[PDB]
Design a protein around this motif. Sequence first.
Motif, PDB file in Angstrom:
ATOM      1  N   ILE D 233       0.849  -1.183   0.000  1.00 21.46           N
ATOM      2  CA  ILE D 233       0.000   0.000   0.000  1.00 21.46           C
ATOM      3  C   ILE D 233       0.888   1.237   0.000  1.00 21.46           C
ATOM      4  O   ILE D 233       2.108   1.162   0.182  1.00 21.46           O
ATOM      5  CB  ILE D 233      -0.942   0.020   1.220  1.00 21.46           C
ATOM      6  N   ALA D 234       0.243   2.387  -0.180  1.00 20.40           N
ATOM      7  CA  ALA D 234       0.878   3.690  -0.050  1.00 20.40           C
ATOM      8  C   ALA D 234       0.205   4.468   1.072  1.00 20.40           C
ATOM      9  O   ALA D 234      -0.991   4.297   1.333  1.00 20.40           O
ATOM     10  CB  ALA D 234       0.777   4.486  -1.356  1.00 20.40           C
ATOM     11  N   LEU D 235       0.990   5.301   1.756  1.00 20.59           N
ATOM     12  CA  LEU D 235       0.461   6.313   2.666  1.00 20.59           C
ATOM     13  C   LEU D 235       0.926   7.661   2.134  1.00 20.59           C
ATOM     14  O   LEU D 235       2.119   7.983   2.206  1.00 20.59           O
ATOM     15  CB  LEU D 235       0.944   6.090   4.101  1.00 20.59           C
ATOM     16  N   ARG D 236      -0.002   8.444   1.604  1.00 25.25           N
ATOM     17  CA  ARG D 236       0.322   9.788   1.146  1.00 25.25           C
ATOM     18  C   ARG D 236       0.354  10.721   2.352  1.00 25.25           C
ATOM     19  O   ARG D 236      -0.545  10.681   3.199  1.00 25.25           O
ATOM     20  CB  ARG D 236      -0.712  10.262   0.110  1.00 25.25           C
ATOM     21  N   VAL D 237       1.386  11.559   2.433  1.00 26.07           N
ATOM     22  CA  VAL D 237       1.554  12.449   3.583  1.00 26.07           C
ATOM     23  C   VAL D 237       1.847  13.869   3.096  1.00 26.07           C
ATOM     24  O   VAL D 237       2.144  14.072   1.911  1.00 26.07           O
ATOM     25  CB  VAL D 237       2.670  11.941   4.521  1.00 26.07           C
ATOM     26  N   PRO D 238       1.792  14.873   3.968  1.00 29.06           N
ATOM     27  CA  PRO D 238       1.887  16.285   3.532  1.00 29.06           C
ATOM     28  C   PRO D 238       3.315  16.768   3.273  1.00 29.06           C
ATOM     29  O   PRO D 238       3.787  17.736   3.865  1.00 29.06           O
ATOM     30  CB  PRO D 238       1.226  17.029   4.700  1.00 29.06           C
ATOM     31  N   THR D 239       4.027  16.086   2.375  1.00 25.74           N
ATOM     32  CA  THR D 239       5.209  16.693   1.772  1.00 25.74           C
ATOM     33  C   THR D 239       5.005  16.773   0.264  1.00 25.74           C
ATOM     34  O   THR D 239       4.307  15.923  -0.309  1.00 25.74           O
ATOM     35  CB  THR D 239       6.503  15.913   2.061  1.00 25.74           C
ATOM     36  N   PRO D 240       5.578  17.783  -0.405  1.00 27.81           N
ATOM     37  CA  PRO D 240       5.280  17.983  -1.836  1.00 27.81           C
ATOM     38  C   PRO D 240       6.117  17.138  -2.778  1.00 27.81           C
ATOM     39  O   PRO D 240       5.793  17.070  -3.974  1.00 27.81           O
ATOM     40  CB  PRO D 240       5.561  19.482  -2.054  1.00 27.81           C
ATOM     41  N   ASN D 241       7.194  16.525  -2.299  1.00 28.60           N
ATOM     42  CA  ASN D 241       8.031  15.710  -3.170  1.00 28.60           C
ATOM     43  C   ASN D 241       9.023  14.944  -2.307  1.00 28.60           C
ATOM     44  O   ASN D 241       9.345  15.380  -1.206  1.00 28.60           O
ATOM     45  CB  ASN D 241       8.778  16.560  -4.198  1.00 28.60           C
ATOM     46  N   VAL D 242       9.505  13.809  -2.838  1.00 31.17           N
ATOM     47  CA  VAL D 242      10.417  12.857  -2.194  1.00 31.17           C
ATOM     48  C   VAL D 242       9.635  11.879  -1.332  1.00 31.17           C
ATOM     49  O   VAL D 242       8.801  12.262  -0.505  1.00 31.17           O
ATOM     50  CB  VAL D 242      11.530  13.520  -1.363  1.00 31.17           C
ATOM     51  N   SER D 243       9.922  10.606  -1.517  1.00 29.22           N
ATOM     52  CA  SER D 243       9.148   9.532  -0.924  1.00 29.22           C
ATOM     53  C   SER D 243      10.118   8.508  -0.353  1.00 29.22           C
ATOM     54  O   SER D 243      11.329   8.556  -0.601  1.00 29.22           O
ATOM     55  CB  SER D 243       8.203   8.907  -1.983  1.00 29.22           C
ATOM     56  N   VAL D 244       9.585   7.582   0.437  1.00 33.33           N
ATOM     57  CA  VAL D 244      10.400   6.538   1.048  1.00 33.33           C
ATOM     58  C   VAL D 244       9.568   5.262   1.072  1.00 33.33           C
ATOM     59  O   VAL D 244       8.393   5.286   1.450  1.00 33.33           O
ATOM     60  CB  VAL D 244      10.891   6.955   2.461  1.00 33.33           C
ATOM     61  N   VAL D 245      10.154   4.152   0.627  1.00 33.36           N
ATOM     62  CA  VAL D 245       9.451   2.875   0.599  1.00 33.36           C
ATOM     63  C   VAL D 245      10.074   1.948   1.639  1.00 33.36           C
ATOM     64  O   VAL D 245      11.302   1.868   1.768  1.00 33.36           O
ATOM     65  CB  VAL D 245       9.445   2.257  -0.813  1.00 33.36           C
ATOM     66  N   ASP D 246       9.217   1.294   2.416  1.00 33.20           N
ATOM     67  CA  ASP D 246       9.593   0.277   3.384  1.00 33.20           C
ATOM     68  C   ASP D 246       9.219  -1.093   2.815  1.00 33.20           C
ATOM     69  O   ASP D 246       8.080  -1.291   2.377  1.00 33.20           O
ATOM     70  CB  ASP D 246       8.872   0.551   4.706  1.00 33.20           C
ATOM     71  N   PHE D 247      10.168  -2.036   2.813  1.00 31.36           N
ATOM     72  CA  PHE D 247       9.956  -3.347   2.189  1.00 31.36           C
ATOM     73  C   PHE D 247      10.341  -4.455   3.154  1.00 31.36           C
ATOM     74  O   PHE D 247      11.489  -4.509   3.602  1.00 31.36           O
ATOM     75  CB  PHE D 247      10.770  -3.497   0.900  1.00 31.36           C
ATOM     76  N   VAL D 248       9.397  -5.352   3.445  1.00 27.19           N
ATOM     77  CA  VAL D 248       9.597  -6.455   4.372  1.00 27.19           C
ATOM     78  C   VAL D 248       9.425  -7.758   3.603  1.00 27.19           C
ATOM     79  O   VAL D 248       8.330  -8.042   3.091  1.00 27.19           O
ATOM     80  CB  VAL D 248       8.624  -6.385   5.563  1.00 27.19           C
ATOM     81  N   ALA D 249      10.491  -8.558   3.537  1.00 32.40           N
ATOM     82  CA  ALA D 249      10.499  -9.778   2.730  1.00 32.40           C
ATOM     83  C   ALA D 249      10.835 -11.008   3.556  1.00 32.40           C
ATOM     84  O   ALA D 249      11.698 -10.970   4.443  1.00 32.40           O
ATOM     85  CB  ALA D 249      11.503  -9.686   1.578  1.00 32.40           C
ATOM     86  N   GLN D 250      10.150 -12.100   3.229  1.00 31.32           N
ATOM     87  CA  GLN D 250      10.471 -13.440   3.692  1.00 31.32           C
ATOM     88  C   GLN D 250      11.463 -14.039   2.696  1.00 31.32           C
ATOM     89  O   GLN D 250      11.145 -14.180   1.509  1.00 31.32           O
ATOM     90  CB  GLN D 250       9.165 -14.242   3.787  1.00 31.32           C
ATOM     91  N   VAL D 251      12.678 -14.346   3.150  1.00 30.11           N
ATOM     92  CA  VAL D 251      13.718 -14.817   2.242  1.00 30.11           C
ATOM     93  C   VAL D 251      14.100 -16.256   2.574  1.00 30.11           C
ATOM     94  O   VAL D 251      13.887 -16.756   3.683  1.00 30.11           O
ATOM     95  CB  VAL D 251      14.966 -13.910   2.245  1.00 30.11           C
ATOM     96  N   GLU D 252      14.695 -16.921   1.580  1.00 29.49           N
ATOM     97  CA  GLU D 252      15.014 -18.340   1.684  1.00 29.49           C
ATOM     98  C   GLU D 252      16.346 -18.563   2.392  1.00 29.49           C
ATOM     99  O   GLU D 252      16.454 -19.425   3.268  1.00 29.49           O
ATOM    100  CB  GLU D 252      15.026 -18.957   0.288  1.00 29.49           C
ATOM    101  N   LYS D 253      17.367 -17.788   2.034  1.00 29.39           N
ATOM    102  CA  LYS D 253      18.702 -17.971   2.591  1.00 29.39           C
ATOM    103  C   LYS D 253      18.871 -17.117   3.847  1.00 29.39           C
ATOM    104  O   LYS D 253      18.755 -15.885   3.766  1.00 29.39           O
ATOM    105  CB  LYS D 253      19.754 -17.608   1.556  1.00 29.39           C
ATOM    106  N   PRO D 254      19.148 -17.716   5.006  1.00 33.27           N
ATOM    107  CA  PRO D 254      19.310 -16.929   6.238  1.00 33.27           C
ATOM    108  C   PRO D 254      20.376 -15.849   6.088  1.00 33.27           C
ATOM    109  O   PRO D 254      21.417 -16.057   5.462  1.00 33.27           O
ATOM    110  CB  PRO D 254      19.727 -17.979   7.277  1.00 33.27           C
ATOM    111  N   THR D 255      20.130 -14.693   6.700  1.00 35.80           N
ATOM    112  CA  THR D 255      21.057 -13.568   6.575  1.00 35.80           C
ATOM    113  C   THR D 255      20.954 -12.676   7.815  1.00 35.80           C
ATOM    114  O   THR D 255      20.305 -13.026   8.806  1.00 35.80           O
ATOM    115  CB  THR D 255      20.761 -12.795   5.282  1.00 35.80           C
ATOM    116  N   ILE D 256      21.608 -11.513   7.749  1.00 42.52           N
ATOM    117  CA  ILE D 256      21.665 -10.520   8.823  1.00 42.52           C
ATOM    118  C   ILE D 256      21.806  -9.156   8.165  1.00 42.52           C
ATOM    119  O   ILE D 256      22.160  -9.049   6.990  1.00 42.52           O
ATOM    120  CB  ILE D 256      22.844 -10.741   9.801  1.00 42.52           C
ATOM    121  N   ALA D 257      21.561  -8.092   8.941  1.00 41.00           N
ATOM    122  CA  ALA D 257      21.487  -6.758   8.345  1.00 41.00           C
ATOM    123  C   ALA D 257      22.800  -6.366   7.675  1.00 41.00           C
ATOM    124  O   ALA D 257      22.793  -5.750   6.603  1.00 41.00           O
ATOM    125  CB  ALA D 257      21.097  -5.721   9.402  1.00 41.00           C
TER     126      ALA D 257
END
Lengths: 338, 338, 338, 338
Positions: D233-257
């Motif tokens: 989904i999107a959340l539109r907020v009161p800024t006129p430009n520049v956006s940020v996407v948050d992505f949460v994935a279930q992955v197959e190969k174990p990892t760390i940040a």
Amino acid sequence: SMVRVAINGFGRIGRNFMRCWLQRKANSKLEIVGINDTSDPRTNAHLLKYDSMLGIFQDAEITADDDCIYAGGHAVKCVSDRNPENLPWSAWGIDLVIEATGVFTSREGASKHLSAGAKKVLITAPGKGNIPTYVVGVNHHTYDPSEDIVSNASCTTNCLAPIVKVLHEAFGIQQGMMTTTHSYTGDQRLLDASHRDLRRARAAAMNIVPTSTGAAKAVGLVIPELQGKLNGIALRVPTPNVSVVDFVAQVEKPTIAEQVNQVIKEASETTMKGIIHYSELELVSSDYRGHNASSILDASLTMVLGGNLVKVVAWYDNEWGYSQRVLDLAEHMAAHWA
Amino acid sequence: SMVRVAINGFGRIGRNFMRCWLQRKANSKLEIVGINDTSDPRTNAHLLKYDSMLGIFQDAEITADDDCIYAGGHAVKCVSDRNPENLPWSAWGIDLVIEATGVFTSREGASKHLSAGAKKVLITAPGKGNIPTYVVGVNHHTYDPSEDIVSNASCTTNCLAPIVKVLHEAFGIQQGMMTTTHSYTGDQRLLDASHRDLRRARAAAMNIVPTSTGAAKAVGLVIPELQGKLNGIALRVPTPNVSVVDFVAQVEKPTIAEQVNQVIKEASETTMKGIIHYSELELVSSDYRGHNASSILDASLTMVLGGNLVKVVAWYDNEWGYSQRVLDLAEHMAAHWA
Amino acid sequence: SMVRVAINGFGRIGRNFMRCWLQRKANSKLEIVGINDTSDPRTNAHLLKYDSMLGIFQDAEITADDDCIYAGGHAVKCVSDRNPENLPWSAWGIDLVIEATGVFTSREGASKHLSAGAKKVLITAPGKGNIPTYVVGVNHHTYDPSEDIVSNASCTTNCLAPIVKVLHEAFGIQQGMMTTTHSYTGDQRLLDASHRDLRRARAAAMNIVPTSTGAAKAVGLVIPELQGKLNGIALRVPTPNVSVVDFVAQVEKPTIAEQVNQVIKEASETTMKGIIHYSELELVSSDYRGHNASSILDASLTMVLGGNLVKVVAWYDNEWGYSQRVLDLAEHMAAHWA
Amino acid sequence: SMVRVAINGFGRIGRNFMRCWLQRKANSKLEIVGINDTSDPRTNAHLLKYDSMLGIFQDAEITADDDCIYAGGHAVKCVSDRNPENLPWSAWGIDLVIEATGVFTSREGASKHLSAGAKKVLITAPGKGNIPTYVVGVNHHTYDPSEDIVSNASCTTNCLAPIVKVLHEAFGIQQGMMTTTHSYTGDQRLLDASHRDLRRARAAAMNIVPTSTGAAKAVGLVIPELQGKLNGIALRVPTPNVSVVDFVAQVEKPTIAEQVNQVIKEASETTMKGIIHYSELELVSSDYRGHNASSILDASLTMVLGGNLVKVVAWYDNEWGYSQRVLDLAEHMAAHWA
Ligand SMILES: NC(=O)c1ccc[n+]([C@@H]2O[C@H](COP(=O)([O-])OP(=O)(O)OC[C@H]3O[C@@H](n4cnc5c(N)ncnc54)[C@H](O)[C@@H]3O)[C@@H](O)[C@H]2O)c1
Ligand SMILES: NC(=O)c1ccc[n+]([C@@H]2O[C@H](COP(=O)([O-])OP(=O)(O)OC[C@H]3O[C@@H](n4cnc5c(N)ncnc54)[C@H](O)[C@@H]3O)[C@@H](O)[C@H]2O)c1
Ligand SMILES: NC(=O)c1ccc[n+]([C@@H]2O[C@H](COP(=O)([O-])OP(=O)(O)OC[C@H]3O[C@@H](n4cnc5c(N)ncnc54)[C@H](O)[C@@H]3O)[C@@H](O)[C@H]2O)c1
Ligand SMILES: NC(=O)c1ccc[n+]([C@@H]2O[C@H](COP(=O)([O-])OP(=O)(O)OC[C@H]3O[C@@H](n4cnc5c(N)ncnc54)[C@H](O)[C@@H]3O)[C@@H](O)[C@H]2O)c1
Ligand SMILES: [Mg+2]
Ligand SMILES: [Mg+2]
């Protein structure tokens, strides 16, 4: 007999809390008798009546003189001292201090109220260190009357934890990520200015501002089963109040969006009535101003992928709803004062 | 032999001033060698480089360590003490202090810098009394080297006073009212909070906020013949920079809009070049970000009624344009040191 | 026997007007029976109920089906046609059309409603020429039942004209300049986009935007003696509702601020009761949301120079207060139908 | 020889694209020769030069007359017709149409440009139906010169897809949720007004507004392996430009940040250089204005829980960065025109 309350820090939460109590004063075991703030009673009476977010207080008359704020004839004594150790809690017979300054969240800081004469301290924020933390509707029944310093967690913790509890008991949460798209608060800067957090330093009504959220740690304090299994961030954005949290969980029992919504709906009608509100309406943040629930599930946004990856989205009025819960936790403490 | 400058208060004005000097230091008699601020050099270097209004500083590299901010190989020593009497001005050989904290605007307050060892102080605001006040292009040539504490007045004064001077010499100003529709500043509150001014207490990005303007008194200080003849107010509005002043004057010589614009235009090309800019374009506040003039006359808005009621409207970048004038006044002081 | 009303254009004014009538329909000669709008009744019922400025409509239930909006058991038939000549005004027995689209402000444009079958038209804006213009409390008692197309002027006219009338009768207005610092409206662009006005083309929530105000010409229409004697501009700023007008007048009878406030205060208690409100409080724009007066004089801002240069400042809720006046004018028309 | 381009819809993207081309005109295989827009050339020249987000265009002179916009002497012919079938593409020898109106995203809509005489159409939005979709750096090399209508996806798709591609090839994405906290766009309403999407109907600079995002479906078009495995989904907020996407994935190969960040860092230096930017800086949205990358990974916010639940956060300038990619895709088509 009444439990006598003093507010320390008459800010957004302090004043929301006062207005919550004023509207529920006919059923309360609490009497707000004192305020300590950096400001004076006339200034604080003016801000109590004229609120940019809540509108003008209409229920009763608000006035003030040199020593007190008066709200419908009820006199609230006012003092102004930045060091809680010097406060007249003993003389005023203060039972409970609502600690809403933001600067006394440690046991050593909050305890200064105890040495000044207060019996208990309720911190309106996550506690620093070894402080029992409570979310009403999640774990407040485990409150121990012997505890003299408690924390009501944060606004985001109060929105997210009731939902997490429901989802965990229904599907078994294994890991979970949260992002709250969150109204700015007074901790941020109006224009770029020094701050311990370099992003909260930046112009708050001009920017999307990534920062920490108390819920990342505090949800696992009130749901001990989930300690170390949740994490996340906040994005502060240019709205003055009302927030929304996005929660993505890996769950054990396969499900679908219909079932997730039905579980939260049933909870909102029974075990979580008055804490969780279930909504199928297509609303926006302005519509949730003044909502009394800790979290409003936006049911239209619920998604599930592959059975075990669940996404829910919930609104919350971070000032008023949180303050309603502060009041609820204080009433609970008054009922189990023993 | 340079004049050694320290900045007290590394805020919006303090950092705009620094970036002004960095862009002009090739033809400068000033060397910025020190900074005092409530914050540390790593935080302040971050804010100097990343500015929500000016954008990312492009020209030189900006770094910091525990002791200094570095701006393209130029070292600026940093200290952090709220009491100017403790500052190392003697040891650092500071000649001139730019007083930009907003809290030492009286003579006794600014004089603390002299007992710490500085020779002169330039206050980036109206003085609280018995402090000579200058506006570059209006009366700065009356600066006397014997004055060790001076004021550069306010942003609104620097915009209005050049136009008032031009209008008064051409038409004879008898009375005048001003209203600046003014971007919010750090003096205001992000959300409703205590303030000595009950309207500046109110959420700045939510509200139109009436308040006082320094120009109401200070224009008559830099144009003595108009003492007591001018008055007005400010309306703070939810933009973070750039303001516009509306000035209605009762004048002695009957005139019309076309002649008023010709008089200001001629001055903007001669006696007020670089101070007043004349614009016939249909622009809005965003277009004037970073403009170097003190006043941009919006010529399309000029109106005159009955010959003697004159209205003019002028834009100003209250952060950057004002800081350009602070620099101009410091250069002038450096040129007239004895 | 009610006057049957249709709304053309269910916009900000159209829906504020509807909510005004719903709150006042107990003592009303009007019955709102139809709506024409570019949108469908389910969408329009949603927007009527959920309003970012007015909040959630509380009094009655609001629902819709394919044909009607329902407001507490009252059915309002809906249609959607951009050409007023096609509207079912004859079949619906419409007496009075509230013309709130902003696109039929000329006599020929508004007259399309008469050929569709309505008897009279009330335009919620200044007319484009040869349309009588009324301000309730200033000249609405000159309304003649033979006029089938009328204008309620603009929000700024409704705020300024009552105060101008009072000031002119007490002191004699010779000339006057106005500037309204005005919330943005739907006429402006959210982000830079094409517009017939090159400044209203610019991002409205980002900018201070100079533009024209209808009050500049329309005040002299409702106070004929002041024709040609007044002028001014608007500055649109990033607030979504509530505006403030600044009026500087050259007056014949010398006076002082205290007398000006006494004259307006006395009028606000007698001849202008319910039109002008007199306020000595230190408030900001948020506090005037929903105020029913046309003009709230901010008495603390009144200033006078040299006896003849008078400045007053007045607040107005440009959506709600103006819509209250539209309703007042429609009630007056309904009372004087023949 | 040059590929001759016409812009249809001279809006935020149309004008950003024009300014992108103007700054890269020394290396382009493209010549922008024509514009079709609802407005006139003088209005469009004014908006091209004076931009609230990009600032004043300084590289070359911009003027206009009745028929053309001139940018540094380069004449761009202008026409104004809402129906593409009537456009003079044949006569102007138009090779490629940049379809940036938002209203011709279907094959039948975009094809009207082909029947008017254009050779190819590049839609600046997800296509409706059976339209090949491309993200530069992800799948643009699979472009087939025989295809006459293409889509460049959406701003969010261009930010998210390069990251998803990297993470998928390194860890194997099994399921993934996205939320973009997104600046408002011209599709939203300045004040509450009718809209096909009841939430986008609401006051955009006053609200957090949940809505759909094109990336939910389009990422799986440019990474076919992941079709049906992503949602959000999107959340539109009161800024006129520049956006940020948050992505949460279930992955197959174990990892760390640490590993997740290192994989994206290596990609940003090699296979994804100029598409992904890697940042360890503590910045906010204003700092990414004008950034040329499709996505800026905010490395400090990367989190991993339990090995297989990955969260990444990336910035993007939804106007300028997306327009840079439109230009890149058009240059690629020009290189493989055959
Ligand atoms: N605003 C929210 O959304 C929200 C929600 C939940 C919890 N909280 C928490 O509540 C606390 C208060 O937050 P707020 O938003 O009301 O901040 P605020 O800045 O509006 O309120 C703080 C108040 O305390 C006063 N104060 C500061 N130092 C003091 C001292 N030494 N002694 C006495 N008074 C002092 C200030 O003058 C101010 O009135 C913070 O801990 C915050 O984290 C805030
Ligand atoms: N912002 C404007 O548009 C503008 C224009 C003209 C003049 N001014 C004047 O400039 C002055 C500063 O305004 P600003 O907008 O930069 O404010 P600001 O709050 O951004 O800056 C003030 C700086 O001083 C620091 N500070 C506060 N007390 C201090 C102390 N005791 N010792 C050292 N540092 C201290 C603060 O941390 C901050 O960094 C004020 O007098 C203001 O009226 C401001
Ligand atoms: N908003 C204010 O503060 C204010 C105050 C006073 C007067 N006005 C005037 O009121 C009028 C409406 O302003 P608003 O702010 O409500 O604008 P708005 O854009 O919110 O409302 C206009 C409504 O008319 C509809 N519409 C447009 N063309 C139409 C047509 N041909 N047929 C039917 N419906 C159509 C639109 O969809 C919209 O619903 C304007 O004349 C304006 O100048 C506005
Ligand atoms: N703004 C963004 O962040 C962004 C990013 C990626 C893609 N897009 C897409 O790009 C497209 C344009 O978006 P925008 O933000 O530039 O919108 P916009 O409203 O600023 O631009 C649309 C332009 O097309 C014109 N127009 C409308 N109908 C027309 C017609 N029939 N004929 C000719 N011209 C017409 C309008 O006058 C306007 O100038 C949309 O499809 C949008 O989804 C936008
Ligand atoms: Mg005269
Ligand atoms: Mg006089």
